[PDB]
Design an enzyme around this catalytic site. Sequence first.
Site, PDB file in Angstrom:
ATOM      1  N   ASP B 290       0.779  -1.242   0.000  1.00  0.00           N
ATOM      2  CA  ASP B 290       0.000   0.000   0.000  1.00  0.00           C
ATOM      3  C   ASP B 290       0.794   1.267   0.000  1.00  0.00           C
ATOM      4  O   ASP B 290       0.360   2.280  -0.565  1.00  0.00           O
ATOM      5  CB  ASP B 290      -0.965   0.051   1.180  1.00  0.00           C
ATOM      6  CG  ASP B 290      -1.861  -1.167   1.242  1.00  0.00           C
ATOM      7  OD1 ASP B 290      -1.341  -2.289   1.436  1.00  0.00           O
ATOM      8  OD2 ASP B 290      -3.086  -0.995   1.098  1.00  0.00           O
ATOM      9  N   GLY B 292       4.379   1.428  -0.689  1.00  0.00           N
ATOM     10  CA  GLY B 292       5.331   1.389  -1.787  1.00  0.00           C
ATOM     11  C   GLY B 292       4.811   1.396  -3.220  1.00  0.00           C
ATOM     12  O   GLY B 292       5.370   2.099  -4.077  1.00  0.00           O
ATOM     13  N   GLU B 293       3.792   0.589  -3.500  1.00  0.00           N
ATOM     14  CA  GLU B 293       3.230   0.500  -4.851  1.00  0.00           C
ATOM     15  C   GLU B 293       2.074   1.422  -5.150  1.00  0.00           C
ATOM     16  O   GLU B 293       1.953   1.892  -6.286  1.00  0.00           O
ATOM     17  CB  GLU B 293       2.788  -0.902  -5.163  1.00  0.00           C
ATOM     18  CG  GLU B 293       3.870  -1.950  -5.186  1.00  0.00           C
ATOM     19  CD  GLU B 293       3.288  -3.345  -5.147  1.00  0.00           C
ATOM     20  OE1 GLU B 293       2.119  -3.483  -4.706  1.00  0.00           O
ATOM     21  OE2 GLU B 293       3.988  -4.316  -5.521  1.00  0.00           O
ATOM     22  N   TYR B 294       1.192   1.647  -4.175  1.00  0.00           N
ATOM     23  CA  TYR B 294       0.009   2.491  -4.371  1.00  0.00           C
ATOM     24  C   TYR B 294       0.185   3.919  -3.880  1.00  0.00           C
ATOM     25  O   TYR B 294      -0.449   4.818  -4.393  1.00  0.00           O
ATOM     26  CB  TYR B 294      -1.234   1.885  -3.664  1.00  0.00           C
ATOM     27  CG  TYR B 294      -1.698   0.503  -4.127  1.00  0.00           C
ATOM     28  CD1 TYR B 294      -2.925   0.333  -4.767  1.00  0.00           C
ATOM     29  CD2 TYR B 294      -0.904  -0.621  -3.945  1.00  0.00           C
ATOM     30  CE1 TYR B 294      -3.340  -0.949  -5.231  1.00  0.00           C
ATOM     31  CE2 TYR B 294      -1.314  -1.897  -4.405  1.00  0.00           C
ATOM     32  CZ  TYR B 294      -2.530  -2.058  -5.052  1.00  0.00           C
ATOM     33  OH  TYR B 294      -2.894  -3.305  -5.532  1.00  0.00           O
ATOM     34  N   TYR B 299      -4.135   8.709  -1.482  1.00  0.00           N
ATOM     35  CA  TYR B 299      -5.491   8.242  -1.281  1.00  0.00           C
ATOM     36  C   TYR B 299      -6.088   8.592   0.086  1.00  0.00           C
ATOM     37  O   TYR B 299      -7.064   7.978   0.510  1.00  0.00           O
ATOM     38  CB  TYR B 299      -5.550   6.752  -1.548  1.00  0.00           C
ATOM     39  CG  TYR B 299      -5.152   6.419  -2.964  1.00  0.00           C
ATOM     40  CD1 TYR B 299      -5.887   6.898  -4.041  1.00  0.00           C
ATOM     41  CD2 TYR B 299      -4.037   5.644  -3.224  1.00  0.00           C
ATOM     42  CE1 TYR B 299      -5.509   6.606  -5.362  1.00  0.00           C
ATOM     43  CE2 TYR B 299      -3.656   5.345  -4.541  1.00  0.00           C
ATOM     44  CZ  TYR B 299      -4.396   5.829  -5.612  1.00  0.00           C
ATOM     45  OH  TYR B 299      -4.038   5.545  -6.901  1.00  0.00           O
ATOM     46  N   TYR B 374     -10.240  -1.790   1.310  1.00  0.00           N
ATOM     47  CA  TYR B 374      -9.747  -1.455   2.647  1.00  0.00           C
ATOM     48  C   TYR B 374      -9.489   0.012   2.940  1.00  0.00           C
ATOM     49  O   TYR B 374      -9.152   0.793   2.043  1.00  0.00           O
ATOM     50  CB  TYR B 374      -8.509  -2.267   2.960  1.00  0.00           C
ATOM     51  CG  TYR B 374      -8.793  -3.679   3.412  1.00  0.00           C
ATOM     52  CD1 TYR B 374      -9.777  -3.947   4.362  1.00  0.00           C
ATOM     53  CD2 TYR B 374      -8.039  -4.732   2.947  1.00  0.00           C
ATOM     54  CE1 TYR B 374      -9.982  -5.251   4.848  1.00  0.00           C
ATOM     55  CE2 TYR B 374      -8.243  -6.040   3.421  1.00  0.00           C
ATOM     56  CZ  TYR B 374      -9.209  -6.299   4.385  1.00  0.00           C
ATOM     57  OH  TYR B 374      -9.344  -7.569   4.919  1.00  0.00           O
ATOM     58  N   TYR B 376      -7.559   2.444   5.956  1.00  0.00           N
ATOM     59  CA  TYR B 376      -6.646   2.420   7.102  1.00  0.00           C
ATOM     60  C   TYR B 376      -6.475   3.755   7.793  1.00  0.00           C
ATOM     61  O   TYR B 376      -6.326   4.790   7.138  1.00  0.00           O
ATOM     62  CB  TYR B 376      -5.284   1.926   6.681  1.00  0.00           C
ATOM     63  CG  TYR B 376      -5.336   0.605   6.014  1.00  0.00           C
ATOM     64  CD1 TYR B 376      -5.526  -0.542   6.752  1.00  0.00           C
ATOM     65  CD2 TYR B 376      -5.141   0.488   4.645  1.00  0.00           C
ATOM     66  CE1 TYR B 376      -5.507  -1.799   6.155  1.00  0.00           C
ATOM     67  CE2 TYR B 376      -5.120  -0.775   4.034  1.00  0.00           C
ATOM     68  CZ  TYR B 376      -5.295  -1.917   4.799  1.00  0.00           C
ATOM     69  OH  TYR B 376      -5.219  -3.166   4.243  1.00  0.00           O
ATOM     70  N   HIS B 425      -1.743  -7.838   7.540  1.00  0.00           N
ATOM     71  CA  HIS B 425      -1.601  -6.418   7.296  1.00  0.00           C
ATOM     72  C   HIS B 425      -0.394  -6.087   8.137  1.00  0.00           C
ATOM     73  O   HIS B 425      -0.517  -5.933   9.348  1.00  0.00           O
ATOM     74  CB  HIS B 425      -2.776  -5.614   7.807  1.00  0.00           C
ATOM     75  CG  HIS B 425      -4.078  -5.985   7.199  1.00  0.00           C
ATOM     76  ND1 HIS B 425      -4.706  -5.184   6.264  1.00  0.00           N
ATOM     77  CD2 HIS B 425      -4.929  -6.999   7.455  1.00  0.00           C
ATOM     78  CE1 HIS B 425      -5.892  -5.692   5.986  1.00  0.00           C
ATOM     79  NE2 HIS B 425      -6.053  -6.793   6.697  1.00  0.00           N
ATOM     80  N   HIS B 584      -5.026 -11.937   9.825  1.00  0.00           N
ATOM     81  CA  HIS B 584      -6.470 -11.943   9.709  1.00  0.00           C
ATOM     82  C   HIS B 584      -7.182 -13.113   9.028  1.00  0.00           C
ATOM     83  O   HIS B 584      -7.066 -13.309   7.825  1.00  0.00           O
ATOM     84  CB  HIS B 584      -6.830 -10.606   9.041  1.00  0.00           C
ATOM     85  CG  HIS B 584      -8.294 -10.304   8.972  1.00  0.00           C
ATOM     86  ND1 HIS B 584      -8.795  -9.264   8.215  1.00  0.00           N
ATOM     87  CD2 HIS B 584      -9.363 -10.889   9.564  1.00  0.00           C
ATOM     88  CE1 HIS B 584     -10.112  -9.224   8.343  1.00  0.00           C
ATOM     89  NE2 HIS B 584     -10.481 -10.200   9.155  1.00  0.00           N
TER      90      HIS B 584
HETATM   91 CU    CU Z   1      -7.612  -8.129   7.053  1.00  0.00          CU
END
Ligand code: CU
Lengths: 620, 620
Positions: B290, B292-294, B299, B374, B376, B425, B584
């Site tokens: 999340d 590093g790549e996105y 966002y 997701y 965060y 995560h 999870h």
């Molecule tokens: Cu999860």
Amino acid sequence: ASPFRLASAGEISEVQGILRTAGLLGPEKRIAYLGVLDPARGAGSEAEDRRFRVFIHDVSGARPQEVTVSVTNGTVISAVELDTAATGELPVLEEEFEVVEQLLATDERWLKALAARNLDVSKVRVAPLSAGVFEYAEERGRRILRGLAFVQDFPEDSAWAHPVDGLVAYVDVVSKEVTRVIDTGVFPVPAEHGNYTDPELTGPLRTTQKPISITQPEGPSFTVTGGNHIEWEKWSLDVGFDVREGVVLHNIAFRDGDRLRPIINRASIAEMVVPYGDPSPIRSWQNYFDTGEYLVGQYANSLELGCDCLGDITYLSPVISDAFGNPREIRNGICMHEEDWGILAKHSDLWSGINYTRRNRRMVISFFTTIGNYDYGFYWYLYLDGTIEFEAKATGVVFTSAFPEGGSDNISQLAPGLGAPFHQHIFSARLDMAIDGFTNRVEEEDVVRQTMGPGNERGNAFSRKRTVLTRESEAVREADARTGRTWIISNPESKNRLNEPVGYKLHAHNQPTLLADPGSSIARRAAFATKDLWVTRYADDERYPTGDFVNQHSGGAGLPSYIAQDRDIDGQDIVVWHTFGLTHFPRVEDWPIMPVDTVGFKLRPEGFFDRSPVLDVPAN
Amino acid sequence: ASPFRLASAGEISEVQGILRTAGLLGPEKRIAYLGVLDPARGAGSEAEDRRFRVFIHDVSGARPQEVTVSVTNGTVISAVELDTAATGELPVLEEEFEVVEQLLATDERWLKALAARNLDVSKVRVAPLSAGVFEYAEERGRRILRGLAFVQDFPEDSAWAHPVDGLVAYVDVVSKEVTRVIDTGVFPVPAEHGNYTDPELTGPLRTTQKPISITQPEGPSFTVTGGNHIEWEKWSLDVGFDVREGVVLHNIAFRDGDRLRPIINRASIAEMVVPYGDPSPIRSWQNYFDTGEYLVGQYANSLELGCDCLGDITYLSPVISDAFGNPREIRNGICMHEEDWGILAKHSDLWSGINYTRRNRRMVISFFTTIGNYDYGFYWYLYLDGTIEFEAKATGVVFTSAFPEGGSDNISQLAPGLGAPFHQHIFSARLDMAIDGFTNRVEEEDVVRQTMGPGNERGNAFSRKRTVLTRESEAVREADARTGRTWIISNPESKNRLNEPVGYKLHAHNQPTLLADPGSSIARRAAFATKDLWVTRYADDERYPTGDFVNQHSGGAGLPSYIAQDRDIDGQDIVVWHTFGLTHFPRVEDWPIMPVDTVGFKLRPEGFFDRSPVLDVPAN
Ligand SMILES: [Cu+2]
Ligand SMILES: [Cu+2]
């Protein structure tokens, strides 16, 4: 009237009356514990028999008694004589603590030790502490208290700042004799004061804090009926109070639509040990069993509005008994309030264009107790999503010693010459489980790692494994944070819509358990503290992990004995006992009053519901 | 003004202008990453020199560039062309995301797949995800995205409830080609809607919740100066924002008397990986980096007052660059407020008659981001007692699949036919340590249990041991919750009044780290996630545990290569990288929308202060 209501002042008085009338409460008799008994297993039992258990002590040295009285019938149901050298001594009385300093003050050996240190006996405070069972045969059957000296220079002075090391005394509180005075050597008495209200230490007080106002303009969301029955956001429970355990929660249930589903029948902290790890003979016997020996509910504070509990609070003022059977109210001793807990659920979806955010809330039920130097806050929380949590807050003044010249492996330094022996605070939560009723079971869930190869050629797969604990001989469990170990309590006869047994998962903090050598007295006496989780078959007389009479009991009482029965726990009426605590190596910032440190655990629903139970929560 | 101030819209426009003037930003160029660089090391800073680093992408296929420009001087400090098949692709562009569904809608292999499942292409949403590095040789050098299908039945529908398993398509987003369409077999598409705003699912909304009003009558206690410099209750710091990392904290210091003492130079979450554990070819490549790549900062949500942030909030609206180098403001993307935090210190002393109670509070700095399904929350907390804490909150909608008929060891069932693959995560906090300045050291502290015998005759003693991590080769550590393992960062040259090196203790949650096989692609790409703690010598080019370019990059960069240098970390300028995450196994209670689950870590003073830093807190 509810069978779980709090004991009334008149009920205590009625117990007093029944006891004196039966000639069991004479001038030499003392009540060391008094508490209402919980209703036995039944449902359609409308014949309410309100019973109280009492531990009566005798100042003349005569054998004590365990008496059960029915406040409804006005009769003594039982009164058994106790052989304390076999089954342990009764809880220590407040008046017995008071006698230690007084007695030492006229003892020649004590006055001599104080003279060599040039300390004025009138300025020497003595911490009257539990004795435990060590190697002193002449103590068996006797009620002993061990004392440690601390100097108090003036009335408003914090004596904890001046421990008098190299000195310990043993006192027989019934015969009122000082049995031993050990002086291993003189140690300088720490000179600096630790007076946290003294402007010379605090400096100018801060003027930077602006007020944070928490109010509820429409009142709380919970209802308190029957004096102690709480209804809040689908939850239901009864808040009890015992002089030994403190706040106890009964019949914790969640109203899932039509039915009110049970989760926990009874939740309490059944024991709490504070063992010290200083091998010095002056302190190597030090182990407080705050709940069992001292009774935490007895020393519960009267919480002040705005200082102890901020917001819209609803208090409960429980009533306990004194040494003579007279009722004593602890005004504002229990806090009840709901507080904001941030975000519950949130999602901003691109595809639907729907942005959703809901806030979380928790119902808080708490109390604060003071055990000498230490003050503890016990907090129980109920959350909107069905989560139950317990948190213990430790504060107070740390127990001190002298800091040895040349350092120490078992004590840390706080100020010049001032030491703080290493210790732990270990709690035990007794959870009388009732997941959708009493037919419960417990499984140990571990994360399973899988190896790369057929069926997992990219080596990305991971699983989980659940092991059911069937007999009590296999129900003494250890933590394993590495493999994400948790324990699920499920009802194998109650399934959710996906046909899987409903359940709740216990998440531990995985802190270290009892560090003492397995052969030590404390390891024998507080065996519960050596393992993280125990599961037993319910039995009405199995109430404490350390047994009923902890004071000076030899060892192996409570959990090890209960487990030795090796009963069936697979789909039975079970009780879960979770051990959790703080290992403390006092730091400089813990002086001269320590900031709150916490420990706890929580239980989250694990397929208990058919979907999220918080979908009906409004926006606002 | 201040060198740590937030990038302005003017500066961003100027970077665009400088790149354009240099012939680095033509029409085919796209800004994949733009961020202001931190001032160079040392106190000998010869005036303002604000530099920005940029990753420039080329839509025609030409090699991308990594450029550093000095916005102050109007120059391009450096500009290097990148061999992406070697050093990794640039972060995914927002425009490349929408390409995937668009392209698949006209590919014959995809339409055939959908036809075999009787699905209307106009109703099939495609989740465009990072590709990683696997066995497909034709992807090396190319920018690939893999797509997974979800049916959205109507516009306001939650497609996550309707996964189309057995199908996945790889797309080259530069050449606009669909390279592969894999159909392993038809799976029934789960039929129940997971529409959490639909009255048919929610039922009547709770009318039981009463208002909780948190107000601050005289305004907050912190000051915001120079746009992002915060001063609160002895604390001082700068709140930065990077498009990759999100909120970053700079120059964390505590005003101890007359001296501002530094604690942490820079703190940020440098990476966060979400690896999936379902070995199905359809999802066995799924791993979201999340950060590093996105790039989580781009966002970041615009937080609403009341529902997202309750109380007296102060917002920062950071500015980032869009794909063309034009500045874009994230309105109210960072919220700042202080909140009551219960009891700080409490003691009721029998001997002195003094009852003392003090309340705690914390400064909160946070932001929320949305990565597909997701969402965060990143929370940083500063407490009155000197404690620093971070907390990640995971919520949103869970990633679904079809639930295999005869069950699954790697997926859990949430509804009929609806599955949810097992995943983690994991976060990496990069803490550039400055405990009382840059000369720092790290010690691993374990509890030491002692054996009963000479010198510990009652077997109650326990100790602790500290091991200095001297070179980077011995600084890759793992947790040990059983021995209460923690890590202390001290300054061997700065001592408290007791002649002990001042310090701070790191407390981890000890959750499981990366579960994937060590020989897997994700273990090599997310090597940082395999150990709990890493310490390195500071270097201005060592910023992320996974390196500068994570997108489709193999192992070879990041922590394992930094550590190899085996530099001296014993009393040097060091950096601590802490790995922590949630493992999870989705519950029915997580569906239709997931209730917040948290994870984090904290640091507490360890001999940093000479006594408690909260003695000057006023009466409450
Ligand atoms: Cu999860
Ligand atoms: Cu302690």
